[PDB]
Curated annotation (Swiss-Prot), chains B, C:
Chief localisation class: mitochondrion
Known catalytic reactions: a 3-oxo acid + succinyl-CoA = a 3-oxoacyl-CoA + succinate; acetoacetate + succinyl-CoA = acetoacetyl-CoA + succinate
Family to which the UniProt record says this protein belongs: Belongs to the 3-oxoacid CoA-transferase family.
Localization per record: Mitochondrion
Active site: E287 (5-glutamyl coenzyme a thioester intermediate)
Protein name (Swiss-Prot/TrEMBL): Succinyl-CoA:3-ketoacid coenzyme A transferase 1, mitochondrial
Organism ancestry: Eukaryota, Metazoa, Chordata, Craniata, Vertebrata
Amino acid sequence: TKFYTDAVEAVKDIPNGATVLVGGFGLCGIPENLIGALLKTGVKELTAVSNNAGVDNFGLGLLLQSKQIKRMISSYVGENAEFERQYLAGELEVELTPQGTLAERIRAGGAGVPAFYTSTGYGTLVQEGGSPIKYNKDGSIAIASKPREVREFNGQHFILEEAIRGDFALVKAWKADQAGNVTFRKSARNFNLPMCKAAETTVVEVEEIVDIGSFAPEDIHIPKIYVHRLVKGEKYEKRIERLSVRKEVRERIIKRAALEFEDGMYANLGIGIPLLASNFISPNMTVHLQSENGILGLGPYPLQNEVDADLINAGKETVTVLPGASYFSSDESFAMIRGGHVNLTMLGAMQVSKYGDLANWMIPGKLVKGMGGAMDLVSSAKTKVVVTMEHSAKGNAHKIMEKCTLPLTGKQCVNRIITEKAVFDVDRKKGLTLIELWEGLTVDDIKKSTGCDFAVSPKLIPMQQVTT
Amino acid sequence: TKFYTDAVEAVKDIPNGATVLVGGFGLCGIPENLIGALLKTGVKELTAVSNNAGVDNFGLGLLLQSKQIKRMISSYVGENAEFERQYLAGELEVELTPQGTLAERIRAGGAGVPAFYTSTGYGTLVQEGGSPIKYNKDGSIAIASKPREVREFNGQHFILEEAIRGDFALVKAWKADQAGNVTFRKSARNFNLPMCKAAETTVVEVEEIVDIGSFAPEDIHIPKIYVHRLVKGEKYEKRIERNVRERIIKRAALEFEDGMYANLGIGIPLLASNFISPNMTVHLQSENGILGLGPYPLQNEVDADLINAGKETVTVLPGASYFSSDESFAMIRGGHVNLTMLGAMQVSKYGDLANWMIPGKLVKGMGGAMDLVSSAKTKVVVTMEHSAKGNAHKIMEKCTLPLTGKQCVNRIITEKAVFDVDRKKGLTLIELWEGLTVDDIKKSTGCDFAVSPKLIPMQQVTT
Amino acid sequence: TKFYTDAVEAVKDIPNGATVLVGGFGLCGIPENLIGALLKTGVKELTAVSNNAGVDNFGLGLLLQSKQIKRMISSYVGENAEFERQYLAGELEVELTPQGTLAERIRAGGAGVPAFYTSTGYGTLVQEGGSPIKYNKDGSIAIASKPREVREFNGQHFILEEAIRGDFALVKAWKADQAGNVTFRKSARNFNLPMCKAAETTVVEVEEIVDIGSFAPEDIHIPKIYVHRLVKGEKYEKRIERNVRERIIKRAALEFEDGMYANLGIGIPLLASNFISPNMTVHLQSENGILGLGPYPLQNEVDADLINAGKETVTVLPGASYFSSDESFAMIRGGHVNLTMLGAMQVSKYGDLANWMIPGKLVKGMGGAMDLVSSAKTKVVVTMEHSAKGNAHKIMEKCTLPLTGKQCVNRIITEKAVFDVDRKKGLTLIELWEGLTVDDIKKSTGCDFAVSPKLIPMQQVTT
Amino acid sequence: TKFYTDAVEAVKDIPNGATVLVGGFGLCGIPENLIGALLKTGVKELTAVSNNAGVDNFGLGLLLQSKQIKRMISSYVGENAEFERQYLAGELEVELTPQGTLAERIRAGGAGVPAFYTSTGYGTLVQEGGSPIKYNKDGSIAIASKPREVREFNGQHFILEEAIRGDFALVKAWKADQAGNVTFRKSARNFNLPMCKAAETTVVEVEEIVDIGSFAPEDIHIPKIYVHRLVKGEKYEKRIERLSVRKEVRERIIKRAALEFEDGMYANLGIGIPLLASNFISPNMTVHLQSENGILGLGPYPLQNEVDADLINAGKETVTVLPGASYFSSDESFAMIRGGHVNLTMLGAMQVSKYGDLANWMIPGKLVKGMGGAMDLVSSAKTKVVVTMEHSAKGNAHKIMEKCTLPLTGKQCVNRIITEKAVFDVDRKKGLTLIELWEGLTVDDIKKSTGCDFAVSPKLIPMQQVTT
Ligand SMILES: [K+]
Ligand SMILES: [K+]
Ligand SMILES: [K+]
Ligand SMILES: [K+]
Ligand SMILES: [K+]
Ligand SMILES: [K+]
Ligand SMILES: [K+]
Ligand SMILES: [K+]
């Protein structure tokens, strides 16, 4: 490891057009100083592999404002209006990439694996091609993503994804010892860790440089072999994007969703209703929440004094962890998710099809912020996928239908749908089975609000509500 | 995580014929209590996915002694007499898999990746198939290994390897907290960590159970989500398993550069590290999961959890790190090690290497050799006596012995010559031992070679 | 073979949604009676595997008019207005497949081969997938084509293509004997022959039923084992469907050599053959299954069974031969044609070729173009106007239009220059039109090129 | 096409070590003159791709006698003792290659297909590797064949086979016109036709050169484009290897096998019992016999005056064809066979396993003549495979057993077994079902003579015998 006292010296040789991996999940674990140094070098036309787009004037957003980015390879790019502006205007290319796939392709790029198979994205625009990479002024697609090959292994379809390697990686870490070994703090690890292994030149900025021997050898997150350039960050804002702090019909969906929890369960809860449901978990029930940004053991929102920019949930809100929690990298988080280790994935949806296809990441020409980890979260047949959503849309437009009309997040991946009117079990071959019916409504009422048929359980019961 | 007080209770339901992942590298990080428990359950016909075969009466060797293993899927199986006997007798199936490949296949198995590509094994028997997995009584072949598909990416050939999942994993770890999070000690991590993620039921034995909160969350090596069953092991044995050449060693010693990351094979390469100048910093990587190897320990510092890839007890230097086997081989396959220096039986004109299989009915396996030479980015230097016993050539047009890799060697150092190797141009003699002539080299080399116009007498480290 | 007297009876059991192979190239060798019978049965939602789309109200076009086709799997679909309308409107699925690939996939489908490799389509949209198979009402894409795997053999890239089998095949043939052996006439053989082997139920319509023994056993093109149902067609329409440039033609004419086998594309290459010396023997291969193309026929010699690849009625010369489409493309893919000369929209520096798709929502298909340039052994010469309308470059660093093949062009002849193309070195200007200078060429060429030290004024055939 | 008046001039440039495709099936369609010319050139160390080994001093055998062949790629090499001598002595390398695979690999080598999949050989030493290519003096294996990759398509396993191309092809044909177009006579076509397309230089010898226009364009078997060198053969012996001519317990198996025929059936009958069974076909029943050397419509053995060396069956016996017969090449014959167009394949076997594995091509260190087309003939799930064999071996050693002990011809490919004691239907999952029992024997008698269990049909009947 070569140590630098000036961030600009560490990045002055990045060529225009370089592919640069940039660490961070939201504004958590972003290489603020290295990004600031790129602003000064003015290097242009970068292909930035960055999970997110920071926010308008922060993180990658700074490089978007300066128009230094030609293309982004990212999983979720919401909360950055300049990003959206450039994207929709055709000034910026964006490959929306499933978060787990992004993490695993980056890992592959550091691990000598040129390609690998994953079921994430199978049956979606990622596999099929046609995801917009570049738009035309008029909202038409100028460059569309290319299809990924599909191959069946063990009776299931997977798509072939290729390694991502960068010319440089700009990585944020917590401490480096004097030998260049590096550790990451809490959830700020995320993509920084695998990105440190996947670029010709890795540049790491750290908050503190400590003596060699400061780390237990077993607990060096990133061995020095991967750290080519190291700079101590001149300053850190650690901007908190979303401050969530606890004190000291939708409710119907939430209270029924809360009954999906079981003791000892590992769950990943999407923003909104699913997460709100966790609030009703029995104190006598232990549920471990997994956060795809690399945390196992999410706790409640922080009391004001527990707020920590390095600890946020997947919805980018400041959070806390419970005793016995663990942090891990993004590639590990998605290995955990794709490998079906999480027992329950509960998320909102725009549409669900009769056999369980899910649409919850894109509305053509309206909502184009990426799928985040959604495609990975529903990719495992081992993980129960529960969709929680209002039964119908605007004009009582159907949301549960024969076939989704919006881009799919996954095919035949939903196992249960909970709405304010019904709970349906979903079978990928037999379809829907109404198993709970809100009191007051009739099976015929559900028929009227559902765009496909469904079997009625012979043991159909009144819809349950958590008692807490 | 479900805690158990009796190891047998934790493994009593393993089915006969189950595929069981068993952690450990050599005798380092082996689940000795879980293995002892299988001896009690008597489960049979196991397909043991285990990097090595323990030793005769220890580690996996206990299950071979009790004939509870039908097949081993391993990378190196030396140092086990009963294993040899059963394999030669046709009583045991042995499927050799490169060590990095084994690690990555297991990791894939817990990561939702059914298959992936690797350079490791391309151009060898791993890709070709055909290795004797099982013999019949008459010594004929009963089962041969299967080939792997080949596909090119960015100009290079890779082979497709598939995920390994087991029905069970028997994992050894250091500590578990009361929530079931687990950590591994020193180099005992190796395969235990990825194996914990790749089986339907993971059973972990630990040396100590600690309070929740004992670990920094950042430093939990295996989060509890992967730990299904946990037992504190009842007994831990801490078993410890363990001039021509001089000229080669002293020339090999000159391959080191300051700040270099190197992986040195057993034998001459490792001996060469003894000549590194105290003024030069070289970080030695060990494929079983260590970066920063130091000298052998004084006897009172021997630590069963810290061995090098040759299973020798070792020490580490300041700033060393430990990591799992899948990470170690991601490090190696990714070209992060600058120099891989190893011995060889033969090297071909364009750099094919044969260094893992001496013909004979017995197999020991390739260990990490195929991975170590798999990257175009890592300089591979072979250090070997120039010619074989009898004087047959070791450097030739094409190897006749099983390949470890194709066009993977960049330099050959013998006691007679140093050759640079180029996969397209072949050999260039760049150094020549005093007293020998280019013609002497020609006579003892089985292929042509260019003579560098800057050919110098062979160098020798001053240390 | 079961004989039928009513075509409807022979096809009444085709299931809705069936995949039906339909013979014919253009209107040559189409099962017009079987198609007329499907109009009567009303079977719907067919996946028609048909090289072409007939014309508006004939051949496959009848089934498009009646909306009985859900998807076409074809290689070229021009000259059909209703096809265009349905495709653009999103009422029809169109899956373009290279013509040689279509033939080989069908042959595989009857030969027990589930998949095989071909150079054809490597590096194009065929390999990449992404072509619009079906549009939605708003003009957005409903279905896109799937990619094909790529694998290297002996240094070259190929793609994996899978067998095509149908539930039924509607085959047109010339004669059947009373045993059900069948023969095909002239170029009407094309896809009929392999399609007869690739469906669960083959239905063949013939022009004449002859006595057993009418054929020499050696000369039965399709043995009866492949003919499940046979009907004599009731009606056969014998429908017949059908200076800058001069300088290019006269220079292209100089690419011919005595004894050469060439395949000449529609347009300039074919026109160049008019300048072949009566003293030179050139055998023109037609991809629809002919070797030995002759001049266009006088009107009273027009024969609906004999057309060239551009669907022009043609004649053949003495010693000509006919063969099926799978054989024709085995001939082409195998490099047996010495010269393939065709037009192009763009050619890249190292010889990538774009010549089959003009962007626009409409698709016509690649026909046999991708196969024709698929062999390293066949010399591929592009004859094209040097620059595009507007003066944009046609020869450039990289094509911007869809590729027909990568690094497949060996020579480019324009009205300004002749370039040799090498896939590694790029372009070499070897001939230069009178009055133009190397700088004029540089200004109208989008990439650099070497200038041959033997550059001569551009040659022109004397004929 | 370049015409030569001297065969030696046509082949004088074949280099030592060349791979030479040599046409012919048995002594039918062999390039006698070109082989004679190679004897004079003395070219050595050839890799001869030749379906068979001719006979001791004829066909390829001439080149084996002269020791000009280093390796043979062949499907059946019986009837040549010098061949066997060299093979067993380690003086000759031999890749035993399934006949259909050989034909299809040669076709691929001429058709631009580098590799393709086939189920022929799946589950055998061809797929697994280990077929002896070169022996050691002591009968041990010195060079073993390498495995072929396996891949599943549409629920079935196939193995990847690569194209075969030669430096030269020595092809025998019937006539050539003056332009070089070529035709083949009767069954002498076989491998000559595809071999003509799969070599850098094709050399064809013909019996007669005729005028251009002699052939109907539609009936040119091999267009001139494939014929690089053409010589009119100086002389032709057309040696008949096996003269079979008709005049003017085993019988039990034969008479029961004869009941497997159905009207309109296409069948391929192996040598011995199956072929003898065809003799009992009802004159009122039309059965089309397919010959894998390229004939459809086999008839009886020839009357003496009908004997024709160009027309032999797969067992190399002189034969006749019935009206409406057709001839075709070896690659087409095996496309017909592998594509399941033949309805019934009936052949002898050494062993059959409980689930239908068949062993009928090799006895290690005893019978090593190759599989001929056996592996292809049982490769199609569409073709009914009926094994006809004596129930038990020598010491009442079992032939029908749990698992074959001899090298397999195919796995789970047999559908019915007919012996002199029983008829078993075979199901690849449920095993054997005794459906006919010879009178006099009891189910227990069968149990004693069968090495595996079997269900007894509830409708078990006395074994039938054809009444003719
Ligand atoms: K699921
Ligand atoms: K799914
Ligand atoms: K290297
Ligand atoms: K290599
Ligand atoms: K070419
Ligand atoms: K090419
Ligand atoms: K069968
Ligand atoms: K089978």
